[PDB]
C-alpha cells in the first residue's frame, strides 16, 4: 500500500543494475551476430 523514499533508493538501484547487466549481454550478442551475419 505505497512505498517510501528510502525503499525506492534500493529498488531503483537494483533495477538499474540489472538493466545494465541485461543490456551488456544484449549488446555483445548483437555485436557477435553482426559479425557472423550482418543485416546492413
Amino acid at each position: 500500500t505505497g512505498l517510501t523514499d528510502e525503499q525506492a533508493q534500493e529498488l531503483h538501484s537494483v533495477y538499474m543494475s540489472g538493466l545494465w547487466l541485461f543490456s551488456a549481454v544484449a549488446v555483445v550478442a548483437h555485436l557477435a551476430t553482426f559479425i557472423w551475419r550482418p543485416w546492413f
Binding site: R37, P38, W39, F40
Partner: protein
Amino acid sequence: SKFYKIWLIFDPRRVFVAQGVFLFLLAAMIHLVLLSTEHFNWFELAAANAA
C-alpha cells in the same frame, strides 16, 4: 510557450503510464508495416544484398 499548465488538468501519473502503452503500440505497428513492404523489409534486403 506556457504548456506547463497541462499538468494542472491532466494527472501526470496517468499520462505517463498511458503514453507508455501508446508509444509501444505505435512502435510495434510501424515496424511490422515495414515488413509487409517489399522494399523496406530489411530481413529480405540482406538476402538480396548477400546474393
